[PDB]
Amino acid sequence: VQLVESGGGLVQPGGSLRLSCAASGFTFRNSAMHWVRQAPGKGLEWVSSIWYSNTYYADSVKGRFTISRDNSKNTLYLQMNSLTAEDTAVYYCARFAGGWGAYDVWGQGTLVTVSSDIQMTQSPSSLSASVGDRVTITCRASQSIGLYLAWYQQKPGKAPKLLIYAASSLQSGVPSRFSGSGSGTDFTLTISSLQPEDFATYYCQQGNTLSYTFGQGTKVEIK
Amino acid sequence: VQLVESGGGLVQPGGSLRLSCAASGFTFRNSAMHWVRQAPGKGLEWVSSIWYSNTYYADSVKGRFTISRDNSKNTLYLQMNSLTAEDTAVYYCARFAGGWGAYDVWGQGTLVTVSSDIQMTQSPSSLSASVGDRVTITCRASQSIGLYLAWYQQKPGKAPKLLIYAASSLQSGVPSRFSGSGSGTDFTLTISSLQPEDFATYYCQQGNTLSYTFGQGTKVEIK
């Protein structure tokens, strides 16, 4: 009882790809077949279902992907169109045992990478502080970005606001308790004495490279 | 100096939507304009840019979205096609100061929700244990799934393997040190005495509802 997948590969965003899942060792025609995917380092996510015929799709792929089957070849297909980087994942086909509500046979998986630079690692992800505390947030770049590192403040329900650019230059009107430092790959934002209005999420952003990338944010929360 | 967005709303997967960003208080024709988006509860992500004419797109939207501008109306547009749930986000337009490498004017944001649903909360996300330890993993459903809860084991580079279905039934061949319990909304997987082959990631999955959602996984790691 086996499911053998094929068709994965590297594809440009906006492009198309068709996955195949060849079954053997069981009566393919009788069985409900699903696709489930797993982004790199992430969890399992249901994608699509087909049975003997009402087919179903998750909102992640509905309207772009088509599931189908050729019972004479004991094969399941996933036609993937208008691909995005967010579709990058290992795609598994699986047999669904509808009496159990569970998948009892899995393919080996096939990797689909949707791709045509600099990673920004912000730390900590969150911190709790009190009014009056000194706070320092760090942002590391995987490659030198020179001085082109900016810091933004974002309050709940509001747009980001530029505070610091070129690593250490303050935007007009930004209070002097904010300062920035660093060059190349290591950068710091410091708040000298936290005020109530400063509890917010802070983001760094590199502006040296054509695909501008943001740090993941630091939530400055109240003790 | 303002950016006023419009166009967001609720759209079906696979559908289209056009966002607008009306500029005032500054000379629009000279300025590089970008779109940056933020999924609910997540960080900022660059989407697309346009200047006076070479336009750029992130791999998340390249080949599906089109950025454009009408200088006579001082307006920036984002044409969104072939939409996915992963496009759900607040979309910001922003003026890019190319000398600073930073965004110095931001719109107020407009929300795009791409949608046509049990939530499974697994805990803990990870745990360290030693050979011989008793381990319990819990899975909670946002509403009753009855008994239709399954548990899978996944080792690095391998496909998931069914261990338990219908909350407490073991798949054939699964060792007796694995057991499951629970009904309705609270479920538990227990390993009575951990063996080296049991260090793996474990996933729960509800099979009561047509969306078949997975828990986020529990990584059982070695002390």
Numbering used by the authors:
A (entry chain H), B (entry chain A): 2 to 53, 56 to 119, 125 to 231
What's in the article?
Diabodies are among the smallest of these bispecific antibodies. They are constructed by connecting heavy-chain variable fragments (VH) and light-chain variable fragments (VL) with short “GGGGS” peptide linkers. Therefore, the two VH-linker-VL chains associate to form a dimer with two antigen binding sites, each consisting of the VH and VL fragments from the different chains. In order to investigate the structural flexibility of the Fv interfaces of diabodies, we have determined the crystal structures of 10 mono- and bi-specific diabodies with and without bound antigens.
During this study, we by accident determined the structure of a non-functional monospecific diabody. We had intended to produce a bispecific diabody, 6277, and to try to determine its structure. To our surprise, instead of forming a functional bispecific diabody as expected, the two chains of the diabody had been shuffled and a non-functional monospecific diabody had been crystallized. In order to understand what caused the chain shuffling, we compared the crystal structure of the shuffled monospecific diabody and predicted model of the intended bispecific diabody. The core part of the interface between the heavy and light chains is conserved in both the shuffled and the modeled Fv domains. The main difference in the structures is found in the CDR3 loop of the heavy chain: in the crystal structure of the shuffled diabody, this loop is displaced by ~4.5 angstrom relative to that of the modelled bispecific diabody. This movement appears to have been triggered by interaction between Trp103 of the CDR3 loop of the heavy chain and the Tyr49 of the CDR2 loop of the light chain. Therefore, it seems likely that in solution our diabody consists of functional bi- and nonfunctional mono-specific diabody molecules in equilibrium, and the presence of an antigen “forces” the molecules into the functional bispecific form. However, the nonfunctional monospecific diabody form appears to be selectively crystallized under our crystallization conditions.
